[PDB]
Design an enzyme around this catalytic site. Structure first.
Site, PDB file in Angstrom:
ATOM      1  N   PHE A 162       0.817  -1.205   0.000  1.00 15.24           N
ATOM      2  CA  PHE A 162       0.000   0.000   0.000  1.00 15.24           C
ATOM      3  C   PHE A 162       0.856   1.263   0.000  1.00 15.24           C
ATOM      4  CE2 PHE A 162      -4.561  -0.305   0.136  1.00 15.24           C
ATOM      5  CZ  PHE A 162      -4.815  -1.636   0.379  1.00 15.24           C
ATOM      6  N   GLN A 203      -5.343  15.402   1.903  1.00 11.85           N
ATOM      7  CA  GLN A 203      -5.213  14.305   0.976  1.00 11.85           C
ATOM      8  C   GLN A 203      -6.554  13.855   0.402  1.00 11.85           C
ATOM      9  OE1 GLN A 203      -2.260  11.048   1.345  1.00 11.85           O
ATOM     10  NE2 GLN A 203      -4.015   9.938   2.230  1.00 11.85           N
ATOM     11  N   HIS A 214      -8.404  10.985  -2.067  1.00  6.23           N
ATOM     12  CA  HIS A 214      -8.232   9.615  -2.526  1.00  6.23           C
ATOM     13  C   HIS A 214      -8.682   9.501  -3.968  1.00  6.23           C
ATOM     14  CE1 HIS A 214      -8.034   5.178  -1.630  1.00  6.23           C
ATOM     15  NE2 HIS A 214      -8.644   5.186  -2.803  1.00  6.23           N
ATOM     16  N   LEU A 247     -15.409   5.734  -0.336  1.00  5.83           N
ATOM     17  CA  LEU A 247     -14.130   5.196  -0.737  1.00  5.83           C
ATOM     18  C   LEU A 247     -14.154   3.793  -1.347  1.00  5.83           C
ATOM     19  CD1 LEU A 247     -11.347   6.120  -0.809  1.00  5.83           C
ATOM     20  CD2 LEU A 247     -10.822   4.606   1.098  1.00  5.83           C
ATOM     21  N   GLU A 284      -7.795   1.280  -2.603  1.00  8.26           N
ATOM     22  CA  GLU A 284      -6.715   1.137  -3.581  1.00  8.26           C
ATOM     23  C   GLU A 284      -6.488  -0.341  -3.915  1.00  8.26           C
ATOM     24  OE1 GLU A 284      -2.546   2.967  -2.970  1.00  8.26           O
ATOM     25  OE2 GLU A 284      -2.200   0.838  -2.602  1.00  8.26           O
ATOM     26  N   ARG A 311      -0.083   8.602  -5.847  1.00  7.80           N
ATOM     27  CA  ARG A 311      -1.425   9.095  -5.528  1.00  7.80           C
ATOM     28  C   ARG A 311      -1.818  10.404  -6.227  1.00  7.80           C
ATOM     29  NH1 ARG A 311      -2.680   7.396  -0.208  1.00  7.80           N
ATOM     30  NH2 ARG A 311      -0.668   8.312   0.428  1.00  7.80           N
ATOM     31  N   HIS A 325     -10.135  12.980   1.679  1.00  8.18           N
ATOM     32  CA  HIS A 325      -9.910  11.770   2.456  1.00  8.18           C
ATOM     33  C   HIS A 325      -9.292  11.997   3.824  1.00  8.18           C
ATOM     34  CE1 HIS A 325      -9.681   7.537   3.106  1.00  8.18           C
ATOM     35  NE2 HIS A 325      -8.360   7.520   3.135  1.00  8.18           N
ATOM     36  N   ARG A 350       0.774  11.717   3.679  1.00  8.29           N
ATOM     37  CA  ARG A 350       0.809  10.489   4.455  1.00  8.29           C
ATOM     38  C   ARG A 350       0.948   9.274   3.546  1.00  8.29           C
ATOM     39  NH1 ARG A 350      -3.384   6.439   5.843  1.00  8.29           N
ATOM     40  NH2 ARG A 350      -4.235   7.507   3.997  1.00  8.29           N
TER      41      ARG A 350
HETATM   42  C1  LIG Z   1     -12.687   5.204   4.300  1.00  7.45           C
HETATM   43  C2  LIG Z   1     -11.367   5.352   5.005  1.00  7.45           C
HETATM   44  C3  LIG Z   1     -10.434   4.324   4.919  1.00  7.45           C
HETATM   45  C4  LIG Z   1      -9.207   4.438   5.562  1.00  7.45           C
HETATM   46  N1  LIG Z   1      -8.319   3.423   5.464  1.00  7.45           N
HETATM   47  C5  LIG Z   1      -7.112   3.491   6.079  1.00  7.45           C
HETATM   48  C6  LIG Z   1      -6.193   2.452   5.989  1.00  7.45           C
HETATM   49  O1  LIG Z   1      -6.455   1.429   5.338  1.00  7.45           O
HETATM   50  N2  LIG Z   1      -5.001   2.558   6.605  1.00  7.45           N
HETATM   51  C7  LIG Z   1      -4.686   3.657   7.314  1.00  7.45           C
HETATM   52  O2  LIG Z   1      -3.591   3.758   7.890  1.00  7.45           O
HETATM   53  N3  LIG Z   1      -5.556   4.671   7.418  1.00  7.45           N
HETATM   54  C8  LIG Z   1      -6.761   4.618   6.817  1.00  7.45           C
HETATM   55  N4  LIG Z   1      -7.656   5.704   6.927  1.00  7.45           N
HETATM   56  C9  LIG Z   1      -7.298   6.870   7.747  1.00  7.45           C
HETATM   57  C10 LIG Z   1      -7.595   6.425   9.190  1.00  7.45           C
HETATM   58  O3  LIG Z   1      -8.698   5.513   9.187  1.00  7.45           O
HETATM   59  C11 LIG Z   1      -7.993   7.518  10.167  1.00  7.45           C
HETATM   60  O4  LIG Z   1      -7.082   8.606  10.088  1.00  7.45           O
HETATM   61  C12 LIG Z   1      -7.982   6.970  11.584  1.00  7.45           C
HETATM   62  O5  LIG Z   1      -8.972   5.948  11.680  1.00  7.45           O
HETATM   63  C13 LIG Z   1      -8.296   8.030  12.628  1.00  7.45           C
HETATM   64  O6  LIG Z   1      -8.404   7.427  13.923  1.00  7.45           O
HETATM   65  P1  LIG Z   1      -8.547   8.435  15.152  1.00  7.45           P
HETATM   66  O7  LIG Z   1      -8.806   7.720  16.470  1.00  7.45           O
HETATM   67  O8  LIG Z   1      -7.459   9.488  15.079  1.00  7.45           O
HETATM   68  O9  LIG Z   1      -9.888   9.130  14.632  1.00  7.45           O
HETATM   69  P2  LIG Z   1     -11.305   8.433  14.851  1.00  7.45           P
HETATM   70  O10 LIG Z   1     -11.144   6.948  15.031  1.00  7.45           O
HETATM   71  O11 LIG Z   1     -12.231   9.004  13.796  1.00  7.45           O
HETATM   72  O12 LIG Z   1     -11.725   9.009  16.284  1.00  7.45           O
HETATM   73  C14 LIG Z   1     -13.079   9.386  16.456  1.00  7.45           C
HETATM   74  C15 LIG Z   1     -13.421   9.382  17.934  1.00  7.45           C
HETATM   75  O13 LIG Z   1     -13.298  10.697  18.490  1.00  7.45           O
HETATM   76  C16 LIG Z   1     -14.576  11.064  19.033  1.00  7.45           C
HETATM   77  N5  LIG Z   1     -14.919  12.505  18.969  1.00  7.45           N
HETATM   78  C17 LIG Z   1     -14.751  13.367  17.954  1.00  7.45           C
HETATM   79  N6  LIG Z   1     -15.210  14.584  18.347  1.00  7.45           N
HETATM   80  C18 LIG Z   1     -15.669  14.464  19.613  1.00  7.45           C
HETATM   81  C19 LIG Z   1     -16.244  15.330  20.538  1.00  7.45           C
HETATM   82  N7  LIG Z   1     -16.468  16.624  20.236  1.00  7.45           N
HETATM   83  N8  LIG Z   1     -16.597  14.875  21.763  1.00  7.45           N
HETATM   84  C20 LIG Z   1     -16.403  13.594  22.107  1.00  7.45           C
HETATM   85  N9  LIG Z   1     -15.853  12.743  21.235  1.00  7.45           N
HETATM   86  C21 LIG Z   1     -15.482  13.150  19.992  1.00  7.45           C
HETATM   87  C22 LIG Z   1     -15.609  10.266  18.267  1.00  7.45           C
HETATM   88  O14 LIG Z   1     -16.828  10.164  19.010  1.00  7.45           O
HETATM   89  C23 LIG Z   1     -14.873   8.949  18.085  1.00  7.45           C
HETATM   90  O15 LIG Z   1     -14.944   8.149  19.274  1.00  7.45           O
HETATM   91  C24 LIG Z   1      -8.906   5.590   6.290  1.00  7.45           C
HETATM   92  C25 LIG Z   1      -9.840   6.613   6.377  1.00  7.45           C
HETATM   93  C26 LIG Z   1     -11.064   6.486   5.736  1.00  7.45           C
HETATM   94  C27 LIG Z   1     -12.034   7.622   5.828  1.00  7.45           C
HETATM   95  O1  LIG Z   2      -7.024   2.557  -0.415  1.00  7.79           O
HETATM   96  C1  LIG Z   2      -7.181   2.220   0.774  1.00  7.79           C
HETATM   97  O2  LIG Z   2      -7.940   1.283   1.084  1.00  7.79           O
HETATM   98  C2  LIG Z   2      -6.449   2.951   1.878  1.00  7.79           C
HETATM   99  C3  LIG Z   2      -5.752   4.194   1.332  1.00  7.79           C
HETATM  100  C4  LIG Z   2      -4.598   4.605   2.235  1.00  7.79           C
HETATM  101  C5  LIG Z   2      -5.032   4.887   3.668  1.00  7.79           C
HETATM  102  O3  LIG Z   2      -6.043   5.609   3.885  1.00  7.79           O
HETATM  103  O4  LIG Z   2      -4.331   4.404   4.594  1.00  7.79           O
END
Ligand SMILES: Cc1cc2nc3c(=O)[nH]c(=O)nc-3n(C[C@H](O)[C@H](O)[C@H](O)COP(=O)(O)OP(=O)(O)OC[C@H]3O[C@@H](n4cnc5c(N)ncnc54)[C@H](O)[C@@H]3O)c2cc1C
Ligand SMILES: O=C(O)CCCC(=O)O
Ligand code: SF4
Ligand code: F3S
Ligand code: FES
Lengths: 577, 243, 119, 130
Positions: free
Chosen positions: A117, A231, A233, A243, A246, A288, A356, A391
């Site tokens: 990836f 970023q 996608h 989404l 990839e 990308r 994204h 990223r």
């Molecule tokens: C479709 C998609 C696919 C992806 N695939 C990948 C991948 O394959 N590999 C990779 O490395 N990355 C991937 N990413 C990026 C990655 O998933 C995210 O950056 C990551 O999941 C973020 O985790 P986090 O805990 O920082 O945010 P999140 O997991 O979104 O944290 C959200 C949490 O914060 C809380 N919160 C937010 N605001 C408040 C508030 N005001 N009060 C109380 N709680 C709040 C929410 O309630 C929730 O519990 C993907 C993103 C998307 C959108």
């Molecule tokens: O294409 C995917 O499934 C993930 C893209 C890269 C990422 O968000 O980590």
């Protein structure tokens, strides 16, 4: 306000938030930790991640290859001291996830499989089918149940943090069901609220990803780092922006225009590769940005197919066949069927680049600590200096577990060393919060929040895109300024207290605008082209290491102005050239 | 062109003002691609801004979507209007106390999930030693059951749950079964008690409607059955232990 | 609210039985309703296969006895088990459910056991 | 004090009347009745058979009463239904991995009917043929 005591408080129950939660409980068993989330922990956007989490596993790999890969893909805006640490703890953390029960897809010999990836030459992406996020979050959440130390506050909207004398001393949150306010006292606080993908009109993100934490941090003097880098996608469904992994293109899917022409060869990513064997960096698997940029150009030529949902190009997956599809593309198969009406074996799926991942976020040291002692940021809402200008795919989920843990551990120590603040000025801070809220409830004007929303999303798309020009960045900056003004004339019609969403959505919109302004201001000020930031204007189309090897810091002053500073980029063993 | 409209009935309920939930009707414009969650949103932005509901992912993965639609437990983000041209009634997830509008108290469900110790147990292995070994064959044992998004549709579906709110229910059982069947876990003993209770697997009369509605195709009914077998194995061992 | 540690259920015995019951009843009852319910009383059988002499010859054999016992008893446990649960689902309040239904089975089991140890 | 008043919809005796999926389940469970009815018949049979030829004849006469016939036909309909549905459910109790996949219910369904057929014949043979 009912008061709760805690040793430390986590805002956000996503992957990183939960990882910090667990980390904290194992580091000190006698802790009272407050895990706070506006949704149930397994609803966090993290669950929707499909690609995978990255970690060095293969014998012929090396941490230095992972490192090189990041810094290079980050266009040299990474904190190399931070990157180094990060790569080194990836396997530890991924392994431990396996140990807690994450069902990683395995090689036939029963060891974890990995795939490629983010363009990484050596494949180090651990995966569970294409529900890697779903498994990770559920594993983490379900794990977190076994620590009595973790006290959960589910469906609690965090309004503000409490700070005096350069130190965090607690926070104030609404109990969403009851509609009453709460105050949690903690000498250290972890921001894990995820990013702000939701400020764009079309984006791949869940409704809850509205940048709240970042906005909160803004209100206290803390800057946001590198907010210009956003970023997209390459392949998202039209309309929803949903989404398509990839992984589609890794397994051999092709991208074609209205003439069924594989267009990417004509943009520096040629010579066309055979349907059987795709190759990394070539064709559909090119870098990308170049793939998204190519969409823009193809649309310019008038080569995009036009749907009511929008102008799109085709992601052709038919040549893969039944079996190949269901083993690795089952989720992608059902999505396309449901949301666009396409069986990926029968016909092509419409796609177009969509917003994204938020590279930017709350500024933090190598320890995840912000400029406010005891206050931490982690995950998508933060900036540890990992991703730089772009990223690497799959480094994000990896980051959650790697830094989540670090944060949980670091925050444990600050809570232990705290000493006390002045409870008068603290209880005054809370009176403050409560009061600012009554200010927003009582506010009249009859502007519809959803339209300021609809219009912010539009300005973001049109001004901060794949390609960016002064004229549009300005028009967006301007637009945001009116919307910021109009926001103050919004009336929350719903006055009820049991799960008032009208109110909640409105508050998040507030945060959006502050954050949006920081992307827009940061982007314009960066008179260069780097990573996700591509400017077409004269003398801004290329990378400038002379003047712009520096992070953008955006502060928001009480006067409502968005002001920029620059800071240096730590380099250890990989200077650019 | 010109978008066709649809008269959508939505059962409103406000605990502060209302004594009981009452129907409310809203004209929504739609096309082939419009979901109920899309419709819900249109209503909130345009017609009724006090309309509260849960959602997030928009792609049937988070599980916060669940509600009743023409009496069927469904996911807003996966229910499409094109199918309900002949009238569409929307209700809070059945067998749950309505709190407000389309928002139900999910508490019992949470405590239920928590009670079955859904986490690897008694595996002393540590991260430095590398990962456990587990073959695709071994995974296949529990795999399908690991895909529950805690949506709760299967509870609105379950008439046994409807008649016994103390019944831990299809999801919870399924989730327990997943860990019991994980080769890497040795906490079966720690889970049996809950499964063995009258409120455990023994409340399932195999209506099997759980598996029918489950948007994630987990077949929780099958796990409950498989759990019935295990509870019976477990009963025998404990009958024959004089020890 | 969900209790810390619940009490073990009794059901695995009844379920065990009802298991065998439903299985036997599924494989074998069809044929049997056909013979006894339709073939015998309508005379639709070759010569005297279902004459009072022949039935009795079989009934008094070792196999026959064992066979008739199971044939009567197994579906009883299954069916009664089910009727007991049908009470709950139909929202009918029944004094000493387990004792009524499972009692009734045990009795007819005995009545039958006696019957096939011969009257 | 709280402003929320959680409303609990009541579950009624007739709940299954609503949705056909439920009705069919009720029907499935309805097969218990004729099951026992029939087992009972076998008892009368068994005892009348032991009280000699005269009683057995009056038992065979019972089974000829046009109503009894109609009930016994229904008994058979019930039986078959029980069989068909039972055969769909038992396979769900198995968790069987054949080279890396979880095997479906079909392989077992077939075996069960195969056995049913052999049995159906073998008995009809032994009962009527010798
Ligand atoms: C479709 C998609 C696919 C992806 N695939 C990948 C991948 O394959 N590999 C990779 O490395 N990355 C991937 N990413 C990026 C990655 O998933 C995210 O950056 C990551 O999941 C973020 O985790 P986090 O805990 O920082 O945010 P999140 O997991 O979104 O944290 C959200 C949490 O914060 C809380 N919160 C937010 N605001 C408040 C508030 N005001 N009060 C109380 N709680 C709040 C929410 O309630 C929730 O519990 C993907 C993103 C998307 C959108
Ligand atoms: O294409 C995917 O499934 C993930 C893209 C890269 C990422 O968000 O980590
Ligand atoms: S089993 Fe299926 S219906 Fe039930 S909660 Fe899980 S995903 Fe939802
Ligand atoms: S519907 Fe209910 S009765 Fe058992 S088969 Fe599913 S849990
Ligand atoms: S919105 Fe996530 S499941 Fe429907």
């Amino acid at each position: 306000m009912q008061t709760f005591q805690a040793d430390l408080a986590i805002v956000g129950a996503g992957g990183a938030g939960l990882r910090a939660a667990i980390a904290a409980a194992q580091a000190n068993p006698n802790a009272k930790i407050a895990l706070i989330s506006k949704v149930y922990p397994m609803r966090s956007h993290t669950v929707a991640a499909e690609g995978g989490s990255a970690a060095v596993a293969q014998d012929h790999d090396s941490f230095e290859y992972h490192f090189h890969d990041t810094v290079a893909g980050g266009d040299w805006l990474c904190e190399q001291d931070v990157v180094d640490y990060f790569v080194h703890h990836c396997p530890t953390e991924m392994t431990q996830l396996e140990l807690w029960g994450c069902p990683w897809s395995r090689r036939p010999d029963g060891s974890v499989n990995v795939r490629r990836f983010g363009g990484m030459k050596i494949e180090r992406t651990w995966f569970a089918a294409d529900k890697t996020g779903f498994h990770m979050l559920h594993t983490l959440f379900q794990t977190s149940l076994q620590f009595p130390q973790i006290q959960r506050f589910d469906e609690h909207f965090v309004l503000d943090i409490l700070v005096d004398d350069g130190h965090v001393r607690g926070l104030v949150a609404m109990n969403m069901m009851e509609g009453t306010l709460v105050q949690i006292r903690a000498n250290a606080v972890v921001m894990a609220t995820g990013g702000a993908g939701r400020v764009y009109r079309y984006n791949t993100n869940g409704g809850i990803v509205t940048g709240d934490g970042m906005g909160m941090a803004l209100s206290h003097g803390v800057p946001l780092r590198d907010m210009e880098f956003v970023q997209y996608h390459p392949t998202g469904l039209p309309g929803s922006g949903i989404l398509m992994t990839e992984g589609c293109r890794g397994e051999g899917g092709i991208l074609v225009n209205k003439n069924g022409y594989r267009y990417l060869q004509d943009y520096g990513m040629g010579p066309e590769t055979p349907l059987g064997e795709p190759k990394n960096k070539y064709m559909e698997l090119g870098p990308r940005d170049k793939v998204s940029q190519a969409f823009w150009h193809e649309w310019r030529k008038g080569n995009t197919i036009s749907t009511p949902r929008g102008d799109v190009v085709y992601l052709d997956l038919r040549h893969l066949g039944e079996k190949k599809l269901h083993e690795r593309l089952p989720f992608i198969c059902e999505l396309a069927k449901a949301y666009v009406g396409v069986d990926p074996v029968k016909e092509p799926i419409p796609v177009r680049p969509t917003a994204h991942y938020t590279m930017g976020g709350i500024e933090t040291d190598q320890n995840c600590e912000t400029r406010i002692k005891g206050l931490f940021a982690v995950g998508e809402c933060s900036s540890v200096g990992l991703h730089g200008a772009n990223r690497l795919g799959s480094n994000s989920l990896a980051e959650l577990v790697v830094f989540g843990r670090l944060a949980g551990e670091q925050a444990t120590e600050r809570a232990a060393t705290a000493g006390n603040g002045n409870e008068a000025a603290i209880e005054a801070q809370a009176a403050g919060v409560e009061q600012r809220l009554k200010d927003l409830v009582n506010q009249d004007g009859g502007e519809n929040w959803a339209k300021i929303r609809d219009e912010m999303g539009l300005a973001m798309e049109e001004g901060c895109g794949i390609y960016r020009t002064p004229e549009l960045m300005q028009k967006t900056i301007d637009k945001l300024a009116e919307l910021q003004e109009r926001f103050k004339r919004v009336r929350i019609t719903d006055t009820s207290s049991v799960f008032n969403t009208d109110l909640l959505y409105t508050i998040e919109l507030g945060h959006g605008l502050n954050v949006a302004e920081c992307m827009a201001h940061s982007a314009m000020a960066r008179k260069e082209s780097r990573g996700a930031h591509q400017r077409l204007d004269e003398g801004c189309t290329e990378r400038d290491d002379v003047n712009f090897l520096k992070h953008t810091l955006a502060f928001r002053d009480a006067d409502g102005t968005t002001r920029l500073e620059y800071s240096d980029v730590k380099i250890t063993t990989l200077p650019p050239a | 062109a010109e978008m066709k409209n649809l008269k959508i009935e939505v059962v409103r309920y406000n605990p502060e003002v209302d004594t009981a939930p009452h129907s409310a009707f809203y004209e929504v414009p739609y096309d082939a691609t419009t979901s109920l969650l899309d419709a819900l949103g249109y209503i909130k932005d345009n017609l009724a801004p006090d309309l509260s509901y849960r959602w997030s992912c928009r792609m049937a993965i988070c599980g916060s979507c669940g509600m009743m639609v023409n009496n069927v437990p469904k996911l807003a983000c996966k229910t499409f209007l094109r199918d309900y041209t002949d009238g569409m009634k929307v209700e809070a997830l059945a067998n749950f106390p309505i709190e407000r509008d389309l928002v139900v108290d999910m508490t019992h469900f949470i405590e239920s999930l928590e009670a079955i110790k859904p986490y690897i147990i008694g595996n002393s292995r540590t991260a430095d030693q590398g990962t456990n070994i587990q073959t695709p064959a071994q995974m296949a044992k529990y795999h399908q059951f690991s895909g529950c998004i805690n949506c709760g549709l299967c509870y609105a579906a379950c008439p046994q749950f409807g008649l016994n709110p103390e019944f831990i229910g299809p999801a919870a059982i399924t989730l327990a079964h997943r860990y019991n069947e994980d080769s890497r876990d040795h906490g079966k003993k720690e889970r049996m008690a809950q499964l063995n209770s009258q409120n455990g697997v023994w409340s399932c009369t195999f209506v099997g409607y759980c598996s029918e509605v489950c948007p994630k195709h987990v077949d929780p009914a099958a796990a409950i059955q498989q759990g019935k077998v295990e509870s019976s194995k477990d009963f025998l061992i404990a009958t024959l232990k004089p020890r | 609210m969900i209790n810390p540690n619940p009490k073990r259920s009794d059901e695995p015995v009844f379920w065990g039985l009802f298991g065998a019951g439903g299985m036997w009843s599924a494989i074998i009852a069809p044929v049997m309703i056909l013979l006894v319910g339709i073939l015998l009383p309508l005379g639709l059988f070759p010569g005297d296969a279902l004459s009072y002499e022949r039935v009795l010859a079989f009934a008094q054999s070792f196999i026959g006895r064992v066979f008739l016992f199971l044939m009567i008893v197994l579906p009883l446990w299954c069916g009664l088990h089910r009727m007991h649960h049908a009470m709950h689902d139909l929202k009918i309040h029944v004094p000493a459910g387990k004792w009524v239904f499972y009692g009734l089975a045990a009795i007819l089991t005995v009545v039958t056991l006696i019957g096939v140890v011969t009257i | 004090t709280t402003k929320r008043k959680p409303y609990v919809r009541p579950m009624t005796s007739t709940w299954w009347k609503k949705l056909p999926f439920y009705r069919f389940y009720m029907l499935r469970e309805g097969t218990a009745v004729p099951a026992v009815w029939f087992s009972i018949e076998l008892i009368f049979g068994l005892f009348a058979l032991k009280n000699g030829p005269e009683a057995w004849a009056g038992f065979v006469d019972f089974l000829q009463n046009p109503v009894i016939v109609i009930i016994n036909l229904i008994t058979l309909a019930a039986a078959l239904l029980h069989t068909k549905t039972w055969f769909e459910l038992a396979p769900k109790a198995a968790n069987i991995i054949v080279k890396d996949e979880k095997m479906g219910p079909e392989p077992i369904i077939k075996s069960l009917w195969a056995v049913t057929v052999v049995a159906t014949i073998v008995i009809l043979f032994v009962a009527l043929y010798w």
